[PDB]
Symmetry: C3
Subunit: 248 residues, 3 copies
C-alpha cells in the first residue's frame, strides 16, 4: 500500500499512477521512494509491460519544491548529498528496468518527469501535454541522463534550446523531435492508448523482454556513468550562489 | 577467384556492372524476393565481388513488386540430421557471416527499394550509406510476432537512427511503416513517386558515379572504420541471442 | 582584427566574418583571427558567443586563394577545429546566408544554429577530391542519420535551410526579412539566464565527448593531409 501512487496490474500490464493530483503530481521525497519500490515490484511480477501515467490534469510538475523543508540537522550540505544519492538511485531504477516501459502522458510534464522519458521504451502523449525542463532558470544542471540522451534523440541544435535555454515544447514539437512516440487528441487519448497497449501485451512475453534486453544491455554502463556525473555536478549546483537565488 | 566480366551469373540474383555501378538484384520475384539459404550465400559472393571490382558504387534492389519479403520461411525444411540444434547454430553462424559482409563493405552502398521490405532486408538498411524508396515501399520488422529478437545490428543502429521512442514501436512492437514515415524517421534517404522512381534514382546515381572514385571510397572509410568493431560486436551478441530464441518455447509456437 | 569584427554587448560576444567582398571566404589569417577571438570570448564576461557573417553570405568556406604546405595546413586545421571542440560557453551560429565547407561542418559542434530562409548548406568535399573535416565524419551521421549524412558529405548535395532544419543541423529557420530581429531578441533573452547554470549545463553535456571529438579531428586531418597530396585532389581543383 502506497501513499502517493496507485499501482494496479492486469491483462499483463502493471500501471503506476502518480496520485497527488492536488499538487499537479509533484514528486516529493516519499514518491521518489515509492516509485522505486513500485518499479522493483514490476520488474519481478508477471506483467509483460509497465506503464507510468499521472492522475488528473497533469503528468507531473516534476520535483516537488516543498522539498525545501531544509530541516535536516546537517543543513544544506547533508541535504544536498542525500538528495544526490537519492536522485542517482532513482534514475538507476529506470536505467535497469528490464521490461518494456511506457509513459502515458496525460498532461503537462516537467523536470525529472520529462528527462526520464529519454529512458522509456515508448511514450504516448495527449495533445494537451507539454514538456518543460527549465533547469537553468533554477540555477541547476541537467539530470535523468538527459545530458546524454537528449542530444542524441533530438539533435544537439534542438536539445540545447530545451535543456540549456529551458524552452517549453508542445506535444507535436516533442513528437517531431523524437521524445514522444505519438500524440492523440485528448478526448480519445486514453481509449486509443490502452487499446494499443492491450494488444502489445498479447505478444510473446519473452520475445519482448529479450528484444529490449538486446537493445539496452550494452548501453546501461554508459548511462549509469552519465547519471553519476550528472548527480555530482548537480550536488554542487544545489550548494551554489545562483541556484539559491534562482529558486526565488 | 570471383572476377567476372560485365555480369556475374547466379541462381537467385542478377549481378551487372555498368557506368561504374555494380547492381545486385534479388531475383525470386515469384516468392516476393524471399531470402533463402542459397541467396544468403550468393549475396555474400556478390558483395565480395563488388568490393574488388571497378565499380565506384554498389546498389541492392529487388526485381518486381517487392524489395524483399525477408528471410524465406521455407527455410523450415528442418531436415538437418542434427535437428533443430544443429539447424539453429548453422543459421546463427551464417547470419553472423552475412551481416558482417555489410559491416565491412568498403565502397558506397545503396539500397533502391522498389517495394515492400521485410525483416533482415530492412534491418540491414541501418548499414547502408543511402537508401532511396518508391512511395509504394513499406518497411516491417515483426520479429516479436515470430518470437524472435532483432538482428542486422538494428538493436544498436535503429535507436540511434530513429530515436528510441520510434525504434521501439518498430522493433519490439512490430509496427509497419510507410516510406514517408521511414524517411521522416531517418531510415530512408528520400522517397519518390513510384512512376518516376527508377528514372529519378538512376539519374542521380549515374551522377554520383562520376565523382572522384577514391575520394568517395576514402570519405566512407573515415566515416565507417571507427564503428566497425562495435557493429561486429553487436552482430555477434544479436546472433547468440537469436540462436536461443530459435530454440524457444515461443518462437516455435509463433511461427505457425 | 583585419578579417573579423568582434563586439561584446549585453553579455553577448559577437564574432562577425568580415570579408564580404569574398563571400567571407576563410583565408589563413582569418583562421588565426577566429582562434584568437574564441580564446578571448572564452575568458571574457559574455554569457553567450555568436558567429555570423557580414553581408549576403555566412561563409564560402576555406578561401582557395590559399609537402610543407600540406602538413602546415593540417596542423592549423587541427588546432582550429579543436578551438570549437573546447569552447566552454554556449556557442551559436547565426547563419545570414549561404554556408560552405568548413563553415558548415563546424556547425556540428555548435550549441544552437539559427538560419535565414535564404541560407543554404553545402559540403562538396568529394567534388574537390577531399575527405571530411570539422568532426563531421562523426557528428553528421549521428545528427542527421547515416542515410542523410552520406548524401551531403560523400555525394556533396546542397541543402536548403528547411532541409537542414529537418535533418537536425539547424535549430530553426526564420524568414529573411525578420531574421535579425527575431534571433537577437531571442538571444538577448537567453543572456539574461543564470550565467553559471548555462556554462555548467553545457559542460555536463560536452565534457565526456571531447576526448572522442579530438581523436576524430586528428584522424580526419591526417587523412586530409594525404588527400591534399593526391592524384585526384590536384586535378579536381581546376
Ligand atoms: Cl531529490
Ligand atoms: Cl537465417
Ligand atoms: Cl588550412
Amino acid at each position: 500500500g502506497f501513499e502517493t501512487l496507485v499501482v494496479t496490474s492486469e491483462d499483463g500490464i502493471t500501471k503506476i499512477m502518480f496520485n497527488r493530483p492536488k499538487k499537479k503530481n509533484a514528486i516529493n521525497t516519499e514518491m521518489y521512494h515509492e516509485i522505486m519500490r513500485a518499479l522493483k515490484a514490476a520488474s519481478k511480477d508477471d506483467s509483460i509491460i509497465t506503464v507510468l501515467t499521472g492522475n488528473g490534469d497533469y503528468y507531473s510538475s516534476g520535483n516537488d519544491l516543498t522539498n525545501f523543508t531544509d530541516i535536516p540537522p546537517g543543513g544544506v550540505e547533508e541535504k544536498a548529498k542525500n538528495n544526490a544519492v537519492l536522485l542517482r538511485e532513482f534514475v538507476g531504477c529506470f536505467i535497469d528496468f528490464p521490461k518494456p516501459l511506457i509513459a502515458v502522458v496525460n498532461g503537462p510534464a516537467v523536470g525529472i518527469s520529462v528527462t526520464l522519458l529519454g529512458l522509456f521504451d515508448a511514450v504516448y502523449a495527449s495533445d494537451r501535454a507539454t514538456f518543460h525542463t527549465p533547469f537553468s532558470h533554477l540555477g541547476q544542471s541537467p539530470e535523468g541522463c538527459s545530458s546524454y540522451t537528449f542530444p542524441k534523440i533530438m539533435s544537439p541544435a534542438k536539445a540545447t534550446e530545451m535543456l540549456i535555454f529551458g524552452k517549453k515544447l508542445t506535444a507535436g514539437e516533442a513528437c517531431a523531435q523524437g521524445l514522444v512516440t505519438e500524440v492523440f487528441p485528448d478526448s480519445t487519448f486514453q481509449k486509443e492508448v490502452w487499446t494499443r497497449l492491450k494488444a502489445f501485451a498479447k505478444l510473446p512475453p519473452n520475445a519482448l523482454r529479450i528484444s529490449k534486453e538486446v537493445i539496452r544491455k550494452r548501453e546501461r554502463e554508459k548511462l549509469h556513468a552519465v547519471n553519476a556525473e550528472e548527480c555530482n555536478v548537480l550536488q554542487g549546483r544545489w550548494l551554489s550562489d545562483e541556484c539559491t537565488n534562482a529558486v526565488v
